[PDB]
C-alpha cells in the first residue's frame, strides 16, 4: 500500500483583493492599507510649536492690531490662521501681501526691538477711532503715525545703521489721505513723498489722494512696505510727508517655520504630521487627506486606497 504525501499551503475564508502587474484583481490571504485617509480632526500641539492666530492674521499680529497684542515677540513652528480672522485697526493694504506673509511665516518669529528714530519737528503717535485699544483711539503698536507740528512738517532725513550680526526687517507705510484738504491738515504741504533706502536698495512711494469705501468709518488708506537691512548697511528714511514710520525692527531668522490656513481646533496631543483637517498618523507612505502638509508626512496622492499584499494568493478549497 505505502503512503501518500501532499504538499500544500494555507488559505483563509475572508481574502482581500489586490492589484498586481499580472492581474487587476487577485485575492490574497491578507493586505495592508498604504493610503492614510483620515485625520483625528484636531491639530496636536506637540511636538511642533503651534501658534493659534485666533482672530489675528499673521500680518495683523506683525503690524500690532490691538486684538493681537498678546502675540508680541512670540515664535512658532506653525502659525495657524483662522477663516474668522478680521482686521480691527486703520484700514490698510500690502502690495505683495502674499510675499510679506510668506517671509515672516518662514522666519518663524515676531521678535521686535524698539529703536530711537530722531523725529524732530513733527507730532508723533498719531491715533484713530478706527483702531481702538482699551477704549481709547489708538494705532498699530509697531508703527508711528507722524503728522505736522505747529502747522509745519519739516522734511525728514533720518538714518538707522545695522551694527548687529543679523538682518533687520523694517515695516513701514504711507498714508493715502481722502482729500487734498486732509493732505494739508495732516502734513502741511499739498503732496508727500517717501524714499526709503539702503546701500543695496531704494523704494520710492507717492501717496494717492482720493476716496475709498469706508472701513470702520475711514475712507482713506495706509499701504504697507518692508525693507531688509543687512549687517553693516544703513536704513535711510527721507520724507516730506505721509510717512507711517517704523518704531524699530523685527528679527528675521531662517529655519523650518511655516503658516497654515485651518479651522481645526488645537488639541493636547502629540502627532508629527499636520494638515488643515487636523493631525494625521504618518505610518503609511501615502495619504489623500490634504495636499497641504507640515512635518513628517505621507505623500499626497489621488488614490483613496492602495492595498499592499501581505500574504500569498488565496485559493479556497
Ligand X SMILES: CC(=O)N[C@H]1[C@H](O[C@@H]2[C@@H](O)[C@H](O)O[C@H](CO)[C@@H]2O)O[C@H](CO)[C@@H](O[C@@H]2O[C@H](CO)[C@H](O)[C@H](O[C@]3(C(=O)O)C[C@H](O)[C@@H](NC(C)=O)[C@H]([C@H](O)[C@H](O)CO)O3)[C@H]2O)[C@@H]1O
Ligand Y SMILES: *[C@@H]1O[C@H](CO)[C@@H](O[C@@H]2O[C@H](CO)[C@@H](O[C@@H]3O[C@H](CO[C@H]4O[C@H](CO)[C@@H](O)[C@H](O)[C@@H]4O)[C@@H](O)[C@H](O[C@H]4O[C@H](CO)[C@@H](O)[C@H](O)[C@@H]4O)[C@@H]3O)[C@H](O)[C@H]2NC(C)=O)[C@H](O)[C@H]1NC(C)=O
Ligand Z SMILES: *[C@@H]1O[C@H](CO)[C@@H](O[C@@H]2O[C@H](CO)[C@@H](O[C@@H]3O[C@H](CO)[C@@H](O)[C@H](O[C@H]4O[C@H](CO)[C@@H](O)[C@H](O)[C@@H]4O)[C@@H]3O)[C@H](O)[C@H]2NC(C)=O)[C@H](O)[C@H]1NC(C)=O
Ligand U SMILES: *[C@@H]1O[C@H](CO)[C@@H](O)[C@H](O)[C@H]1NC(C)=O
Ligand V SMILES: *[C@@H]1O[C@H](CO)[C@@H](O[C@@H]2O[C@H](CO)[C@@H](O)[C@H](O)[C@H]2NC(C)=O)[C@H](O)[C@H]1NC(C)=O
Binding residues for ligand Z, rule: CB under 6 A, are 152, 155, 157, 193, 195, 209-211, 238-240
Residue 107 DSSP SS3 = helix
Q: How many C-beta neighbours within 10 Å does residue 297 have?
A: 21
Out of a copy of itself, ligand Z, ligand X, none, what residue 221 binds, judged by CB under 5 to 8 A for its kind, is a copy of itself
Cβ nearer to ligand V, comparing 191 with 303: 303
206 torsion bin: left (phi>0), alpha (psi -120 to 50), beta (else): beta
| By the rule CB under 6 A, 68 interacts with ligand X | no
Which of ligand X, other proteins, ligand Y, none binds 236 (CB below 5-8 Å, type-dependent)?
Answer: ligand Y
Contacting residues toward ligand V, per CB under 6 A? 38-39, 276-277, 289-290
As measured in angstroms, the least distance from the Cβ of 313 to ligand V is 32
Report the partner that residue 298 touches, choosing among other proteins, ligand Z, a copy of itself, none (CB closer than 5 to 8 A by kind). other proteins
- In our burial notation (b when 16+ CB lie closer than 10 A, e otherwise), range 183-222 reads bbebbbeeebbbbbbbeeeeeebebebeeeeeeeebebbb
Specify the residue for cell string 521678535: 111
The verdict on 220 binding ligand X (CB under 6 A) reads yes
| Residue numbers 119-178 binding ligand X by CB under 6 A | 126-130, 137, 145, 147, 177-178
Q: Does 116 bind ligand U (CB under 6 A)?
A: no
Other beta carbons within 10 angstroms of residue 164's beta carbon come to 14
Nearer to ligand V, 91 or 278 (CB): 278
Does 234 participate in binding other proteins (rule CB under 8 A)? no
Is the preceding peptide bond at 47 cis, omega within 30 degrees of 0? yes
Query: Shortest CA distance to 10 belongs to which of 28, 35, 32?
Result: 28
Tell the smallest beta-carbon distance from residue 291 to ligand V (Å): 7
- 8 A C-beta contact, residue 230 and residue 162: yes
Contact (CB, 8 A) for 262 and 293: no
Question: CB–CB of 258/80 below 8 Å?
Answer: no
290 binds, among a copy of itself, ligand V, ligand U, none (CB under 5 to 8 A by kind): ligand V
Residue 14 binds which entry of ligand X, ligand Y, ligand U, none, CB below 5-8 Å type-dependent? ligand U
Q: Which of the choices ligand X, ligand Z, other proteins, none does residue 193 contact, using the CB cut-off of 5 to 8 A by kind?
A: ligand Z
Binding site for ligand X (CB under 6 A): 126-130, 137, 145, 147, 177-178, 182, 186, 217-218, 220
Amino acid at each position: 500500500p505505502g503512503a501518500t504525501l501532499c504538499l500544500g499551503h494555507h488559505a483563509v475564508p475572508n481574502g482581500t483583493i489586490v492589484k498586481t502587474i499580472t492581474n487587476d484583481q487577485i485575492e490574497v490571504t491578507n493586505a495592508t492599507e498604504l493610503v492614510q485617509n483620515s485625520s483625528i480632526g484636531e491639530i496636536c500641539d506637540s511636538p511642533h510649536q503651534i501658534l493659534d492666530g485666533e482672530n489675528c492674521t499673521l500680518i495683523d499680529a506683525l503690524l500690532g492690531d490691538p486684538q493681537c497684542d498678546g502675540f508680541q515677540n512670540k515664535k512658532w513652528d506653525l502659525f495657524v490662521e483662522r477663516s474668522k480672522a478680521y482686521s480691527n485697526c486703520y484700514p490698510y493694504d500690502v502690495p505683495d501681501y502674499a510675499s510679506l506673509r510668506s517671509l515672516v511665516a518662514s522666519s518663524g518669529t515676531l521678535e521686535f526691538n524698539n529703536e530711537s528714530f530722531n523725529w524732530t519737528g513733527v507730532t508723533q503717535n498719531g491715533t484713530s477711532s478706527a483702531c481702538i485699544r482699551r477704549s481709547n483711539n489708538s494705532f498699530f503698536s509697531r508703527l508711528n503715525w507722524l503728522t505736522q507740528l505747529n502747522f509745519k512738517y519739516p522734511a525728514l532725513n533720518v538714518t538707522m545703521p545695522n551694527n548687529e550680526q543679523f538682518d533687520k526687517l523694517y515695516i513701514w507705510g504711507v498714508h493715502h489721505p481722502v482729500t487734498d484738504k486732509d493732505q494739508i491738515f495732516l502734513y502741511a504741504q499739498s503732496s508727500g513723498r517717501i524714499t526709503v533706502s539702503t546701500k543695496r536698495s531704494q523704494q520710492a512711494v507717492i501717496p494717492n489722494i482720493g476716496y475709498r469705501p469706508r472701513i470702520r468709518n475711514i475712507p482713506s488708506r495706509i499701504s504697507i512696505y518692508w525693507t531688509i537691512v543687512k549687517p553693516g548697511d544703513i536704513l535711510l528714511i527721507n520724507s516730506t510727508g505721509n510717512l507711517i514710520a517704523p518704531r524699530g525692527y523685527f528679527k528675521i531668522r531662517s529655519g523650518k517655520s511655516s503658516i497654515m490656513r485651518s479651522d481645526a481646533p488645537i488639541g493636547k496631543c502629540n502627532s508629527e504630521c499636520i494638515t488643515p483637517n487636523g493631525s494625521i498618523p504618518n505610518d503609511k507612505p501615502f495619504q489623500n487627506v490634504n495636499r497641504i502638509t507640515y512635518g513628517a508626512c505621507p505623500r499626497y496622492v489621488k488614490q483613496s486606497t492602495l492595498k499592499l499584499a501581505t500574504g500569498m494568493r488565496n485559493v479556497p478549497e
